[model samples]
Target chain A: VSPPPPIADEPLTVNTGIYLIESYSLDDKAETFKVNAFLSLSWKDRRLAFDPVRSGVRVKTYEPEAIWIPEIRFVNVENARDADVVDISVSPDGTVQYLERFSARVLSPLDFRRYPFDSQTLHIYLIVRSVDTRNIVLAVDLEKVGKNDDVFLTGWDIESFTAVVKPANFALEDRLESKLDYQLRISRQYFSYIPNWILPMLFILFISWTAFWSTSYEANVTLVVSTLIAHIAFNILVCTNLPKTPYMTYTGAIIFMIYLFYFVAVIEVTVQHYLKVESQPARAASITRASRIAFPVVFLLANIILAFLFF
Target chain B: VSPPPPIADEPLTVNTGIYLIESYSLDDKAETFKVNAFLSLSWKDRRLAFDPVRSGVRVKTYEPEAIWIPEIRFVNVENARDADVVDISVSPDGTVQYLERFSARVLSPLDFRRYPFDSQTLHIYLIVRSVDTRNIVLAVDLEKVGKNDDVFLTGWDIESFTAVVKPANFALEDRLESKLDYQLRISRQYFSYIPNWILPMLFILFISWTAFWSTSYEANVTLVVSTLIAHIAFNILVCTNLPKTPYMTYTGAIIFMIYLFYFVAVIEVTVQHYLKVESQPARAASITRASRIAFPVVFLLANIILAFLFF
Candidate 1:
């Protein structure tokens, strides 16, 4: 068979342009706040513009003429002057070297690889120098940087501007062909909304729990067994998405541990259901107590304590 | 909190013993069927056996004079009688070095760390001459030879023998240190059982599948939803056991594929059931024809083709 097609692999041509991203800083409790910033631009590579038309996947060849790059600067807070923690100043009013240094960390769809260069994976980084402790707020703010519009950029046209939320900090650096896109941006996300796995897991557990309401042992057994099979099937389904890891991922560990506990619960359920079916009310009652009351509470307690201890 | 008990940070010692572990044949088409082999034997480490017996984690010292070792031999069928293929001619007065040169391979766990003195890890090897290659009966006999029990010039009494399963053809010289008084006559064994996730998974799938028998749309929907949840939960569960694999395992792929098909089936089932429930017999009939029969058959066909093509 013929070899697979090549991806659009080409060395990136560094052209200077004013691209506005986001920034942040940390408080005493290490709570992060976000911010925004802009840069004054100048460079030698003239094939530079914010016009998405020429800088997309279609642009196989480079244009020779100087393109007018648009500047979209967010407003610097009035009376809240720009902090000069790091040396942003460069020599001789406008220098190409200084402009290159400033624009080194600018990200684009073509530039970033780790993020699925599609609609969902866009986060902007603004490298801001913190005045205190001489640290830079190499921040990431998860905000929409506008949908691509065919706005013209000539010489130094102020094409568009907007304000963003901020005051958070991250480490920063600038180097050639730096694959900063792959670096983790969101350390954690609060899930007031249910996490992806919760619905399925809860459904399985709920069905398992509902086996208790049934007076017939057979009914209870059927429900419990059904739930067990469902759990295995679900296990198979979710397994495809994750990597073949040695130790368990946090998600994997949680799922596995829960299943182990549930396996024990199922055994108890089966025994109790069997007893109930045999008309051994006292025995069934004991098992019911074990499964419904004791096991669950013990499981929960053990899970919380063991899980915490494990970490 | 109290810190963890101090780790000994020492290599664990071992005795000779058989392990009931799984083994795979090199080729599926070959006569030798790959099945897990079980072995049992009793032996103590030569060094440990010689050392002063003290329970509960203590330093062990070896006897200087004792030289313990193990060996293996293979035999070929001569007129339906077993004869050592290599050491065939056991004449008393001969100018042979030690054994004949017909064919021979070392088979013992030899420790390279303690090359001169240590007989901890025996390096095992196997050599066999095929007696029958026709009728799918490729008969070749292999054997395990332990340390000589005589204590003459330089030898220790062979306390017990531990035999390990030898891989076909190649002389596999590997190291192993057993702590328990493992018999050298014993081979590798199943050290651990299946993880707990599988039981839950099976249960969940069983519950999910029962949705097929439901008469009402609500029951069907409930079953389908529950099954879907089970599918996803097990998906996560399987992820825990498997590596962060890019391609899915056969089990994983099959289960997930089944889930997806079942999911679509549920939608179709629900739609049809809804129509039937509403007394739209004509619409229900069409849906039943399209979904209940057509969709399932088509999906099954697709699955068959895909299974053949992909797997």
Candidate 2:
């Protein structure tokens, strides 16, 4: 009765270490993304503890089949695509380390609200199941994991990296699990949007606006309609790259405004011709002359407003 | 030759049963949804089996800790919020059953491309770990789980339900785990968009066109600009309700076209004024007369095109 049976530990402490993302790509079909990375997933066991000073057993390596390693998996994976075990090691103090490189497609819910100006968070969750906080506690070494060569992700700028550890309870069972989430924040590099979407759109708007400078109403109308059709084609191209959503984006909104401006230009030509046929030469001439200045002013102001509201 | 000693039956088999959703709400901020349901989760152990004729045992009930049960969790849940178990039972055939009523928030990626006219699939994945298809297979009695009381979700219509069983390999491990995904397909009830967006947009377009009938250039220009401002406001409202994307949706395209018409009307007013001021009365009269018929025709045609392209 003097010393009760050594109470079994209520919780298990699992120390997780550094990570490096080698490459990545967004998968639109599954609303997730694929990533390749190398990292260390380790834990400790007091039962296997030994004194390095006396035993001279500072480190030992073991093949996966030789030891009972916790099967850590990416919980958010759509399928049971398990983590790869490239190497495993243990120290005299019972610290078990599993170092491996993995290429797994992980779930990273995307938000397209800001479109080209948007930043995305790609999360890599390393989860150990069946254990709770009491049974296991996860830890992360942020500085070591954050080191990686600049990823050559076209159209994306790697902004920052973050690591978080938390308890994951699969059930109200006695043992709790732990989750290590590594998040990579990236922003879109919109240079492509400028040339592919913006410049072309501006050119079309400019052509449509030129209808004002022309002398012949029929010629002006043709130019405006042609511009309209071209803009539609451009929109179709934009749609192909965009994740379909109901909301209007900065690009979509701007294109929409430009389309309206083109239609207005055509209407102006029609109204002017009607005046000429009505024998109102003086009225028609005055309208065209006023437009030469008013057209540009309105166009500039519309652009300014668009920039203010959307950009 | 004697079945290889039953291979020691490495992993335990857990048979999942039917489920009924009592209620659910999609959490936009977290990119997940919450659901409350009733279901039975059970496993078979030959040792627990007893002859019904001899023991007069049809079923038995137990508490959570009374036996070692498989911890089945929704793999897609953002947090380790386990399902609350309400009841447990067992049959004479060794089926250890847990009659649980659970409230869980699960992740089901959303695609809002068509938005109001779009249908969505909400997935509920019941997953087990470590064990693969060879050892533990997940089975779903589709006839039992697809029972719902026709929940008329606000702004959405319950369209259909589907259940499927597939093997998911979390990694190249001992076995590939099994995932049972229940898909609930729902469509938006576009009744709200009709009054809030469609009808109002149409009325605004019509009002802007009335500028064509006005004889005064100054009055017509004011009307046109006013229409543009109003349309922009409508677009803002529409944007607030939409999921942001670069693809121009049907409503967005229509609104965009109306804006162009307004601009065209303003341009016409300008051109006509120029003609009148320059003593081109005959030319102005012809342009104005052409617009009287052309404006409506173009408007109608553009709408037709939009319907054909988007709808």
Candidate 3:
């Protein structure tokens, strides 16, 4: 009923591996992903050893309740992992190979600083608690630590599912705990955003700049104000759609900068109309002509810099 | 190992149950929803019987490979189900109980006719193929057919998770097949759509009617045309965001009707300007007054009718 007695006073080593079955539901707002994986564990119990000839079986199967198992748990999961024991087979030499299929909502916080162009390293932490009978340590079985070829995170490109072989040994509440870090690397597939969000916002900004094409104050006002209003709607729409972040994201920066340009464009339109009313038509004409080139140039450069900063 | 011999020439009855652990990823575009559930199967096999006193255990556990089981499968799954056998226990009377936790993407077509306010009945079809040894008939165990209280599909209100008691028996590929239906009923939570889409589109439509307030031809043209352009942007935006449905949805009808209203408004703006240019101010003003009341009244009534039709 206790963990296998330590081997020559050494903590029991439980070889562990995780083979992903499915990965989906990557939620930006919740900063979580749903994962389904095969969790395999192996250990030895000398007391359960038996001769194959005597047992009449090469491998023996036992109900989990009859065996001693390391208490394993997840570090960053929303709830207790939902798991079902797949099999528990004991060899003639008494080495037990236990496996289970578990589903979990892993709570791995995401970085939005470079979002829309960002690559993320999602973590799945596995830990085993020390028991009064004997302390147990964990080791990664590299061969079994992998993902299915069909595993996919719908909007993301999964780059890798690798584990850091080293175990992080720590003490919590006077108990020694062994933890392992499994990482899943992924990058955003941003092609979809171009047509849906990026282009629509860009189109509105360009239309606002159309005020430079006309000298009529009324027409200029109508053009800039109307487009600006629409720009504001997109701003609201984008903000509502994206996960809220206090710091600027790559896409967030682009969206915010467009608003600033709209504001400046209005100011330029106002100044041009006032100057024309004051009979400085020549100066107003010069300013208007300069803006026609300046606005687009500044916009393109700002966007380039944002992309560079993110990627 | 084979299916147990039936009594009185009846087919082997496999009592089946599905307990939902998690339900998520209801993709509107793909017409699929992911499910995680515990699949339970129970049947009596006389060959497995053993005297409890002699066996030294009241209940015996068996590896899945040691016992024969019904080859159950999902009919509407996107791919072969990802499953892991949890446990297999045999009672003194030789009744074998089997359980597995499985994850699958169930393909259930959605009806989008009243979408945004729509309710759906998603199906998870369980099927068992008859073998040459014996024909397996499926039965639902009402006690075990249930779902976790915390089970949820984000953005949806899960109303019910129930299985039909009756199994549909049929022949397929020259073999008898038993099919069971598990229905998950859900309704959309439409509050989030209000501020993001419906209200914004309504605002654009209302703004288009402001041409009635102004007598200036240039101002009227700018108002109607500019708002019309923004309305078009939203039309494209909304369409791109939602799943493409060939049939008109309640919201689809609303959006389409607004486009028609915008066109009619532009025509009104054009007609009024023409009359003004023709020196018929009285006639133009009369039409303008008629429109201010007509636009709002018609919009309200049409929206009311659309809502009624959908609900």
Specify the highest-lDDT model's number.
3
For model 2, residues A1-311, the per-residue Cα lDDT tens digits are: 01111237554455665454444446543667655455676666555567777865465656677665665667777645535454566778677767665556677777766666777887777776543223444667543466345343434677866786554545435555667788878887754455445664665566466555555665566556655765665565445456666677776666677777777777788877889889897877788778778777887898788767765
Encode model 3's per-residue lDDT on B164-221: one tens digit a residue: 9899999998999999999999998776566545665666566566667666677667
The 10-residue segment with the lowest total lDDT in model 1 chain B: B132-141
Give lDDT: candidate 1, residue B203.
Answer: 50
TM-score of 3: 0.63
Binned by DockQ into CAPRI classes (incorrect, acceptable, medium, high), candidate 2 is: incorrect
Over the stretch B102-144, how does candidate 2's per-residue lDDT look in tens digits? 7766556565546567678887777654421124557765545
What would the per-residue lDDT of candidate 1 be over residues A141-181, giving only the tens digit for each residue? Answer: 23422222342222112234332334333321111111112
Estimate how well candidate 1 is docked, as a DockQ score.
0.07
Q: Quick one: ranking by DockQ, best first?
A: 1, 3, 2
Chain A alone, TM-score for each of the models?
A: 0.41, 0.83, 0.96
Worst-scoring 10-residue span by lDDT in model 2 chain B = B1-10
Q: CA lDDT of each candidate?
A: 0.35, 0.62, 0.80
In candidate 3, chain A reaches a TM of 0.96
